[PDB]
Design a protein around this ligand. Structure first.
Ligand code: SF4
Ligand SMILES: [Zn+2]
Ligand SMILES: [Zn+2]
Ligand SMILES: [Zn+2]
Lengths: 760, 366, 408
C-alpha cells in the first residue's frame, strides 16, 4: 500500500496497515534523515520486520548515496529464514507492481553447518568438526598440492568455484540458506564462499549477532562498506549479554591438560619437520623481520581461523619480539601454560585486575607485555606454517593463546576471576578461570564507530533510559509506540495471592517452600481447566523447575494437570527439547490440550515463538533473578556503580524484568491474536518492577488486576476468553486499529498518529 | 466490594429514576438478523451431537450446562420442526471417549423431546470424543441423497477433545463427503473446532448468556445457505390424500398401522407402495418416496420470496398517518416503522409480529 | 468361519419379532435363509466404532484398585496400557502362564517406570524400561523433529555453537555432580515426556517444500490480507407467479363482462344508502324453524357422518396375526421396492430382480395360505390391504417386464 511517509513512496507488502506502523515509519524516517543511531520500540503486534524492511528498501530504492547496504541482524537461524522470506514477499510485491526491473540481491549468511554440501562433511553434527574437515579438504597448502597433483583431497566445490565462480555475481535473486545450497548444488560450488564473496554486491544481508559483534569472526565487512551502511539489530534485549559472552574467555583444567598434550604433539611436529624442511622457516623469519605477517595473507580464504580477539582499533603493527624461532615460541607457550596452571591451583576464589595478573606474570615467570600481545599472531602464523590438518585437535592451545592476548591488551574494565569450584559444584575438581568482561560498551564501540546508523529494535525494551547508560550510546530517537486497540487483545494479571491467602513469591532463593509451590500447582491446574490450546509456563531456573515438578509428583497434583492437558516438561538436551516442542505443537492441533513448561533463561524462549493458538496463557512463574551465578554479577554491579552511574537494585530489577517481559511477550502475533499473560508472584506489583515492564503492557494492567487471587484471576481469564472468542471480523478494525488506502490521506488520522507515538 | 456507589443523584427525585432507567436499559439488547436472496438447503438432515463431558456439569449457567443446553435443545427441536417439516433430527450424546446414537434420524418431535426428558437424568462422566461422534454422524449421513444439505450441530463444551485416531483425515473425508458441521462452543475457542467449522463449511460460536445462546440456536434453526458444491437434484415426491373409512366401512381395508398400535380403519395411503400411514409427513418406510401433504411445502415458502427491511425512524417526522396501518392504533411511542414498497405505517408490536410470525407485509398483499 | 450364523442367531434371540419374520419367510418356503440374512445388513461399526484412547492418568484413573496391590480388572485401564506401553504388551505376550498370574503380574506392574516414575535396576520390568530408553534414544537419534523446517529445531537454533572454551556460560551441562534425588527428578521428567509422547502417538495411527510452508505460515497475518467468507449462490427466481397461485387447481373463475361491474356498483351504491331495519327484516320465524329442523340430526348439514362403523369382533389374536403379516410383507416389499426403483440396467441387478420375482410369487402363495388359515374362523376381518400391497408388487413386476421387453 503506497504510503507517503513525509518524503517518500513506500510499497507496503499488504493492502492494510496499523497506525502503529506509520508512527514507526515516521520515526525511522527521522532516524535516517540525520545520521544517528536511534532506539525504537514497536511491540510484537505490528510486522516490525515488515515495516523495517519496507522503509529500508524505500531509501535504497530512492537514495543511492547515503545508504549503501542494509545489514540486518537477527539472532537465530529460523529468524534469519523468516526475515529472508519476508524480504522475498516484499520483492514479489515489488515485482508484481512493476515487472522484472528488480535488481536486488537479498542474501542470508550463517556458517558451514548450514551452507556446506560435501557428503563427508555434511554428516558431522558439530561446528568445529565441520570447520576442521573443511580445513582438511581445502586450505592454502592442500589446495596447492592438489593444484600440482591429481589424487590429493579436495572438495570439487571450492575448486570449481575457484575455477569460474569468482567472476559472476549472483543476479538479483533473494536467497535463503536452502535456495543458496540449491544453487551450490546446481552449478557446483561452495555456497558458503559464494555467500561470503557476494557480501560485496548485496543490498540486504541478514546474519547473526556473533557474526558482527565478535572481533574474532567479523572481519568481513570492511570500513568503506561500513561508512554508508545501515545496520538494524532485531530482538536486541541481551546485546550486553552477547557482548559479555563475546569477549569473556573461560579456561578449565581439562583445557590445560589437553593444551599440554597439544604442546608435546606440536613439539614432535617441529622435530620431524626440522628433519624434513628448512626453507619456508627462512621465509617465516623474513616475513617476521621484514613485514608484519602479511606475506601469504592475500590468498587467505580457508586458512583463516578465529582471528585475534582484540578489537579492531587496539591491534598493533610491530614485530613479535623474542618469539621468532618456533622452538623458543614453544618454550614461551610452555612457560605461560605452566604459570596459568599454577595460578589455577589456588583453592579459594580470587579476583584480580588484569594488570595484577600481568605483574604476577612479569615477576614470577619472566614474560613481558608485548610478546604476550603478539601470541595470537604468532600461533596463527606457526599453525599455518607446519601444514597441520585438523585444527579441532588444536582448539585448547589457540584458546590459551587468545586468552594471552586479552590479558595483555585490556585493563581497568575487565576482570580475571578464578574459581576453584563452581557455585552448584562445591568441592569437585573443576577449577576454572573467567577472564570476564563487564564493559558492555567495548564490543559495540567499533559498531558505532564504523557504521552510519545502527537501529536497536525489539518488542519489549524497557526502560529505554538504560541502554544509553550502558552502551556508551547517544541516539537521535528514543521511541516507545503505544498499543492502540479496538479490542483488549491481552490481559496481564499479577496473581500474587494464594487461594489460602498465602503470599506467592520466590524469596526462598530456590530452596523449596512447600505452600508456595502448592499454590503454583493450584494455579496451573485451574488455569489448565480454563484456558484452551496450549499453556506456556516459564520457571526461574532448571534446578527450580526440576524441584517444582519433583514436588508436583509426590504431592498429588500433576496427574490432575495430566487429566486436563498434556504436559511437555523441558530438559537441557538439544534434541529432547526439540522433540518435546514438536509433540507440544502436534498436541495443540490434534484436539487435546498441551502445556509446555520451561525455564525463562534458555533457548526455549529466545527464538522459538508461540503464535495464535500455541500459547494462550503465558504463565510467568516467579521473578527471574540470576541467582546461581558467581561474583561476575557482584563485579559487574560494582562496575555499574563505579564507572557508570547505575545502582545495584536498579540493574537487578532491570535485568529481571527484561527476561520476564521477554518470555511473556511472545504470545501475540497480530491484532487478531489474544494472549492471557499472567505473572505469578507478588513482587511484580511493587512499582519499580511493574514500572520496568514495557508501556504496551502497563497500559492494559488494571489496578483491579493488580494483585489478584488465584480464583479471581481464573474468573478474569474466563470472562476474558468468553468476551474474546466471538467474531472479531476485519470490519471491526477499519475505524480504530487498521487503516485503508484512503484512511491515511485524512489529516485527522495524521493527528491521531501524532498522538500515538511517544519518545523518551 | 463497594458496588453501592453506583447510584448517583443530581436532583435525586428523578435522578435515581435516571440511574435505574439507565441500568434497566443497559440490561437489554436487540437481535441481529440477516437477509439473503440466495439458495438455501431446505431438505436438511441435521444431526445434533451434545457433550456428555465432565464440563457439562460445570455451573456457569444457572442450572448446570447439561440442563440448560438440553432445555434449549428441546426448544430447538420444537422450533425446527415448527419451521422445517420435511427435515429430520438425530441426537448423539458423546460420553466417556465414545459416541452413542441416542435418538435415530427421524422427523417427529415426540421421540426426540421424550428422549431429552429422559436425558436430563444422565450422569455426564468422562471426556468427549469428537472423532467417534463425527464418525457415527458420517456413517448415517453417507447415504442420504445428495440434495440433502447434511448438517451436524455439535454443542461442545470441554477442551480436551479426546479422540482415538487422527481427526484431520476425518475433516478431509467430511470435506469430500459434502457434509456441513457447525459447532456451538462453551467457555472457550478451540483451534480444532475452528478448523472443523471453517473447513467443513459451518460456523463456530461461543456463549455468553442464556439470551446469546438462544440467539445462536435460533440462528441455526433457519436453513443456512448452500455452497457451490451441494447437488441440486429433483427428488421424486408423493402427495397421499387422506382417506377415511370409505362409506361407513363398506368394503374398507382394516389395517393395524405401519410404525402398540390399534386397528386403523382409514387414513393416509402411499402413492408408490399403497401402505398405511397414520401421520403425514413421513418418509416411506418400504419405498424410499417422501410423502408430503403440501401445506408442508407451503409452511416453508417464506424463505424463497422473503421479507425486506422496515425503514425505522424514531422521531415525529412528517407523519400525516397518525394511526397504525397494522392494527389501527395510535403511535404513543417514538418508534415509527415504514415499509419499502407500499410505505405504510407500523408500530413496534406490528414490527415484531410481522417480522417474526406473519412473515409478510399486510400492505403489499392489498 | 460361521460368523453370519452367529449374527442372524444373536439377532433372532434378542429380536424375537424378527425371528418370527425369519420363520414366516424362510421356514414358510418363500425364500432361502441365505438371501434373507444376506441383504439385511444393519448393525454397528465396532464395539464403539473405535476404543477409548488413553486420555491421561491411565495409571491413575482408578489407580491400582478395582475395589498397594489391590484388584486389577478395569477394561479401560488394561486396554490403554495395551496400546500405550508396547513393552508391557510384549511382556504380556511372554509371562502369561508360563508361570505367573495377573495378580502377581500386575503386582509386578505397579513397580517403577510405570507407577512410581523411578529409574533403577529392578525386577522384571527392567529390560522393558531399557527398551523404552532405546525407543527414546531412537526418537532422539534414529529420528528427530519432523517439523524442524522453520522452527522448533532446538539443537541447531544457534548458528555458531562452540564447546565450553571461549564463552561466558560454559558451566551449563556439568559432567560431574550426579546425585540420587536429582537423577530421580530428571527421571520423572523423562517419564512424563515419554508418557505424553506415547499418548499423542497412540492417538495418531500409522526439503524446501516443508520449510517454505512453515515460513509462509508463521509470517502471515490474518488481518492484513484477504477476508474469510466463502460464497452465497444468488437465487433470483424467474417466474414467481407460479408461487403466487400455488398447487391449488384452477377453479372455475369466469367473472362476466365489465358491464356487470358498472351495474353492480350502481345497485350497491343505491343499496347501502337507506339502511338499519333490526326488528323486522332479519328473521322470519319459519326460516328459523326450518334451520333447527336442518341442524337436528336427521336433516341437511348433518351429513349422517362421524359414524365410523367398525368390526371389533375378535381383536387380540387377529391383531397378532396382522403384526406378523405386516412385518413380513414389510420386509418383502422393503427388498422389492429397494432394489426396484432405478432399473440398474445390468445382469446382476436383473438377477436380483428375478430372485425378487420368485420371492414375490411364493410370498403371494404364503399370503393366500395365511388368509385361508386365518379368515376361516368366524368369517370377518378383510385382510385385502396386504393383498393390495402384494397385488401392486405383482403389477409393478409385470409392468416392468413389459417395459423392459419394450426396451429390448
Ligand atoms: S569447501 Fe565448501 S564443500 Fe568443502 S567442506 Fe568447506 S563448505 Fe563444505
Ligand atoms: Zn411407498
Ligand atoms: Zn409493504
Ligand atoms: Zn400496530
Amino acid at each position: 500500500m503506497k504510503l507517503n511517509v513525509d518524503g517518500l513512496l513506500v510499497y507496503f507488502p499488504y493492502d492494510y496497515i496499523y497506525p502503529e506502523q506509520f508512527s514507526y515509519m515516521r520515526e525511522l524516517k527521522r532516524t535516517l534523515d540525520a545520521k544517528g543511531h536511534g532506539v525504537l520500540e514497536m511491540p510484537s503486534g505490528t510486522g516490525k520486520t515488515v515495516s523495517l524492511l519496507a522503509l529500508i528498501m524505500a531509501y535504497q530504492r530512492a537514495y543511492p548515496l547515503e545508504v549503501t547496504k542494509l545489514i540486518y541482524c537477527s539472532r537465530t537461524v529460523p529468524e534469519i529464514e523468516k526475515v529472508i522470506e519476508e524480504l522475498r514477499k516484499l520483492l514479489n510485491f515489488y515485482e508484481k507492481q512493476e515487472g522484472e526491473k528488480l535488481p536486488f540481491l537479498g542474501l542470508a549468511l550463517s556458517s558451514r553447518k548450514n551452507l556446506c554440501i560435501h557428503p563427508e562433511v555434511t554428516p558431522l553434527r558439530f561446528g568445529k568438526d565441520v570447520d576442521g574437515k573443511c580445513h582438511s579438504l581445502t586450505a592454502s597448502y592442500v589446495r596447492a598440492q592438489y593444484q600440482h597433483d591429481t589424487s590429493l583431497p579436495h572438495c570439487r566445490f571450492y575448486e570449481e568455484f575457484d575455477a569460474h565462480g569468482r567472476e559472476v555475481p549472483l543476479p538479483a535473486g533473494i536467497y535463503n540458506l536452502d535456495d543458496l545450497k540449491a544453487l551450490g548444488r546446481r552449478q557446483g560450488w561452495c555456497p558458503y564462499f559464494l555467500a561470503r564473496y557476494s557480501i560485496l554486491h548485496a543490498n540486504v544481508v541478514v546474519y547473526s549477532y556473533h557474526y558482527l559483534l565478535d572481533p574474532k569472526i567479523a572481519d568481513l565487512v570492511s570500513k568503506e562498506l561500513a561508512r554508508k551502511a545501515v545496520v538494524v539489530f532485531d530482538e536486541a534485549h541481551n546485546i550486553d549479554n552477547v557482548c559479555i559472552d563475546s569477549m569473556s574467555v573461560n579456561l578449565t583444567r581439562r583445557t590445560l591438560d589437553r593444551c599440554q598434550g597439544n604442546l608435546e604433539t606440536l613439539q614432535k611436529t617441529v622435530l620431524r619437520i626440522k628433519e624434513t624442511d628448512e626453507q619456508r622457516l627462512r621465509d617465516e623469519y623474513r616475513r617476521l623481520v621484514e613485514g608484519x605477517x602479511x606475506x601469504x595473507x592475500x590468498x587467505x580464504x580457508x586458512x583463516x581461523x578465529x582471528x585475534x580477539x582484540x578489537x579492531x582499533x587496539x591491534x598493533x603493527x610491530x614485530v613479535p619480539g623474542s618469539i621468532r624461532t618456533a622452538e623458543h615460541f614453544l618454550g614461551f607457550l610452555r612457560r605461560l601454560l605452566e604459570y596459568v596452571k599454577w595460578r589455577l591451583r589456588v583453592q579459594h576464589v580470587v579476583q584480580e585486575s588484569p594488570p595484577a595478573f600481568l605483574s604476577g606474570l612479569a615477576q614470577r615467570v619472566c614474560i613481558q607485555r608485548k610478546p604476550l600481545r603478539f601470541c595470537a599472531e604468532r600461533l596463527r602464523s606457526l599453525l599455518h606454517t607446519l601444514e597441520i590438518t585438523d585444527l579441532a585437535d588444536f582448539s585448547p592451545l589457540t584458546l590459551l593463546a587468545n586468552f594471552a592476548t586479552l590479558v595483555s591488551t585490556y585493563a581497568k574494565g575487565f576482570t580475571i576471576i578464578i574459581e576453584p569450584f563452581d557455585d552448584r559444584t562445591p568441592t569437585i575438581a573443576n577449577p576454572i578461570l573467567h577472564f570476564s568482561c563487564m564493559d558492555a560498551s567495548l564490543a559495540i564501540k567499533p559498531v558505532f564507530e564504523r557504521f552510519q546508523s545502527v537501529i536497536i529494535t525489539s518488542g519489549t525494551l524497557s526502560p529505554l533510559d538504560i541502554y544509553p547508560k550502558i552502551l556508551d550510546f547517544h541516539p537521535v530517537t528514543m521511541a516507545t509506540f503505544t498499543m492502540t486497540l479496538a479490542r483488549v487483545c491481552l490481559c496481564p494479571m499479577i496473581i500474587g495471592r494464594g487461594n489460602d491467602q498465602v503470599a506467592i513469591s520466590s524469596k526462598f532463593e530456590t530452596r523449596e517452600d512447600i505452600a508456595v509451590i502448592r499454590n503454583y500447582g493450584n494455579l496451573l491446574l485451574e488455569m489448565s481447566a480454563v484456558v484452551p490450546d496450549g499453556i506456556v509456563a516459564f520457571f526461574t531456573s532448571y534446578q527450580y523447575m526440576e524441584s517444582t515438578v519433583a514436588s508436583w509428583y509426590e504431592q498429588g497434583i500433576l496427574e490432575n494437570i495430566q487429566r486436563n492437558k498434556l504436559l511437555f516438561i523441558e530438559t537441557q538436551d538439544g534434541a529432547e527439547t526439540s522433540v518435546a516442542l514438536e509433540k507440544y505443537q502436534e498436541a495443540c492441533e490434534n484436539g487435546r490440550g498441551a502445556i509446555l513448561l520451561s525455564v525463562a533463561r534458555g533457548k526455549v524462549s529466545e527464538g522459538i515463538d508461540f503464535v495464535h493458538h500455541y500459547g494462550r496463557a503465558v504463565i510467568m512463574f516467579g521473578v527471574p533473578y540470576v541467582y546461581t551465578q558467581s561474583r561476575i554479577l557482584k563485579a559487574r554491579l560494582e562496575y555499574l556503580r563505579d564507572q557508570f552511574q547505575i545502582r545495584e537494585n536498579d540493574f537487578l530489577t532491570f535485568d529481571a524484568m527484561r527476561h520476564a517481559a521477554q518470555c511473556v511477550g511472545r504470545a501475540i502475533r497480530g491484532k487478531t491474536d489474544y494472549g492471557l499473560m499472567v505473572f505469578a508472584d507478588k513482587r511484580f506489583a511493587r512499582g519499580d518492577k511493574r514500572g520496568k515492564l514495557p508501556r504496551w503492557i502497563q497500559e492494559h494492567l488494571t489496578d483491579a488486576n493488580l494483585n489478584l487471587t488465584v480464583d479471581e484471576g481464573v474468573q478474569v481469564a474466563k470472562y476474558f476468553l468468553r468476551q474474546m472468542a466471538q467474531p472479531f471480523h476485519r470490519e471491526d478494525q477499519l475505524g480504530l486499529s487498521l487503516l485503508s488506502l484512503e484512511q491515511l490521506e485524512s489529516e485527522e488520522t495524521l493527528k491521531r498518529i501524532e498522538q500515538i507515538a511517544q519518545q523518551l | 466490594x463497594x458496588x453501592x456507589x453506583x447510584x448517583x443523584x443530581x436532583x435525586x427525585x428523578x435522578x435515581x429514576x435516571x440511574x435505574x432507567x439507565x441500568x434497566x436499559x443497559x440490561x437489554x439488547x436487540x437481535x441481529x438478523x440477516x437477509x439473503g436472496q440466495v439458495r438455501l438447503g431446505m431438505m436438511r438432515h441435521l444431526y445434533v451431537v451434545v457433550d456428555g463431558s465432565r464440563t457439562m456439569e460445570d455451573q456457569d449457567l444457572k442450572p448446570n450446562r447439561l440442563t440448560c443446553t438440553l432445555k434449549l435443545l428441546e426448544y430447538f427441536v420444537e422450533e425446527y420442526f415448527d419451521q422445517n417439516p420435511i427435515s429430520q433430527i438425530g441426537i448423539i450424546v458423546t460420553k466417556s471417549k465414545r459416541a452413542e446414537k441416542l435418538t435415530e434420524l427421524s422427523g417427529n418431535p415426540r421421540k426426540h423431546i421424550t428422549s431429552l426428558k429422559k436425558a436430563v437424568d444422565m450422569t455426564c462422566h468422562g471426556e468427549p470424543s469428537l472423532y467417534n461422534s463425527l464418525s457415527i454422524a458420517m456413517q448415517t449421513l453417507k447415504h442420504m441423497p445428495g440434495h440433502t444439505s447434511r448438517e451436524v450441530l455439535i454443542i461442545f463444551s470441554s477442551l480436551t477433545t479426546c479422540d482415538p485416531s487422527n481427526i484431520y483425515d476425518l475433516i478431509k473425508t467430511l470435506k469430500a463427503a459434502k457434509i456441513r458441521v457447525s459447532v456451538i462452543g462453551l467457555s472457550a475457542e478451540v483451534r480444532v473446532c475452528t478448523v472443523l467449522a471453517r473447513e467443513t463449511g459451518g460456523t463456530y460460536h461461543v456463549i455468553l448468556d442464556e439470551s446469546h445462546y438462544k440467539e445462536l440456536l435460533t440462528h441455526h434453526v433457519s436453513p443456512p445457505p448452500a455452497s457451490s458444491s451441494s447437488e441440486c437434484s429433483l427428488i421424486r415426491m408423493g402427495f397421499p390424500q387422506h382417506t377415511i373409512x370409505x362409506x361407513x366401512x363398506x368394503x374398507x381395508x382394516x389395517x393395524x398401522x405401519x410404525x402398540x398400535x390399534x386397528x386403523x380403519x382409514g387414513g393416509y395411503f402411499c402413492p408408490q407402495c399403497r401402505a398405511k400411514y397414520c401421520e403425514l409427513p413421513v418418509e416411506c418406510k418400504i419405498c424410499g418416496l417422501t410423502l408430503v401433504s403440501a401445506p408442508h411445502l407451503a409452511r416453508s415458502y417464506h424463505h424463497l420470496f422473503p421479507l425486506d427491511a422496515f425503514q425505522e425512524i424514531p422521531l415525529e417526522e412528517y407523519n400525516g398517518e397518525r394511526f397504525c396501518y397494522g392494527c389501527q392504533g395510535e403511535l404513543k411511542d417514538q418508534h415509527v416503522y415504514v415499509c419499502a414498497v407500499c410505505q405504510n405505517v407500523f408500530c413496534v408490536d406490528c414490527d415484531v409480529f410481522v417480522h417474526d410470525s406473519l412473515h409478510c407485509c399486510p400492505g403489499c398483499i392489498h | 468361519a460361521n460368523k453370519e450364523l452367529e449374527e442372524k442367531n444373536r439377532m433372532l434371540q434378542e429380536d424375537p419379532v424378527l425371528f418370527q419374520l425369519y420363520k414366516d419367510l424362510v421356514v414358510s418356503q418363500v425364500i432361502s435363509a441365505e438371501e434373507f440374512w444376506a441383504n439385511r445388513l444393519x448393525x454397528x461399526x465396532x464395539x464403539x466404532x473405535x476404543x477409548x484412547x488413553x486420555x491421561x492418568x491411565x495409571x491413575x484413573x482408578x489407580x491400582x484398585x478395582x475395589x498397594x496391590x489391590x484388584x486389577x480388572x478395569x477394561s479401560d485401564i488394561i486396554e490403554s496400557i495395551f496400546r500405550t506401553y508396547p513393552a508391557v504388551k510384549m511382556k504380556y505376550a511372554e509371562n502369561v502362564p508360563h508361570n505367573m498370574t495377573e495378580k502377581e503380574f500386575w503386582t509386578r506392574f505397579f513397580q517403577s517406570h510405570y507407577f512410581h516414575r523411578x529409574x533403577x535396576x529392578x525386577x522384571x520390568x527392567x529390560x522393558x524400561x531399557x527398551x523404552x530408553x532405546x525407543x527414546x534414544x531412537x526418537x532422539x537419534x534414529x529420528x528427530x523433529x519432523x517439523x524442524x523446517x522453520x522452527x522448533x529445531x532446538x539443537x541447531x537454533x544457534x548458528x555458531x555453537x562452540x564447546x565450553x572454551x571461549x564463552x561466558x556460560x560454559x558451566x551449563x551441562x556439568x559432567x560431574x555432580x550426579x546425585x540420587x534425588x536429582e537423577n530421580s527428578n530428571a527421571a520423572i521428567i523423562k517419564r512424563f515426556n515419554h508418557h505424553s509422547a506415547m499418548v499423542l502417538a497412540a492417538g495418531l495411527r500409522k526439503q524446501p517444500a516443508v520449510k517454505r510452508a512453515k515460513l509462509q505460515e508463521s509470517i502471515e497475518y490474518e488481518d492484513l490480507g484477504x477476508x474469510x467468507x466463502x460464497x452465497x449462490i444468488a437465487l433470483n427466481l424467474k417466474k414467481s407467479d407460479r408461487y403466487y397461485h400455488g398447487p391449488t387447481p384452477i377453479x372455475x373463475x369466469x367473472x362476466x363482462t365489465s358491464q356487470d361491474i358498472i351495474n353492480s356498483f350502481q345497485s350497491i351504491r343505491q343499496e347501502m344508502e337507506a339502511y338499519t331495519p333490526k326488528l323486522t327484516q332479519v328473521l322470519s320465524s319459519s326460516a328459523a324453524s326450518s334451520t333447527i329442523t336442518a341442524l337436528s340430526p336427521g336433516g341437511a348439514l348433518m351429513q349422517x357422518x362421524x359414524x365410523x362403523x367398525x368390526x371389533x369382533x375378535v381383536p387380540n389374536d387377529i391383531q397378532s396375526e396382522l403384526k406378523h403379516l405386516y412385518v413380513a410383507v414389510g420386509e418383502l416389499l422393503r427388498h422389492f421396492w429397494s432394489c426396484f426403483x432405478x432399473x440398474x440396467x445390468x445382469x446382476x441387478x436383473x438377477x436380483x430382480x428375478x430372485x425378487x420375482x420368485x420371492x414375490x410369487x411364493x410370498x403371494x402363495x404364503x399370503x393366500x395360505x395365511x388368509x385361508x388359515x386365518x379368515x376361516x374362523x368366524x368369517x370377518x376381518x378383510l385382510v385385502s390391504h396386504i393383498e393390495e400391497m402384494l397385488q401392486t408388487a405383482y403389477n409393478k413386476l409385470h409392468t416392468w417386464x413389459x417395459x423392459x421387453x419394450x426396451x429390448x
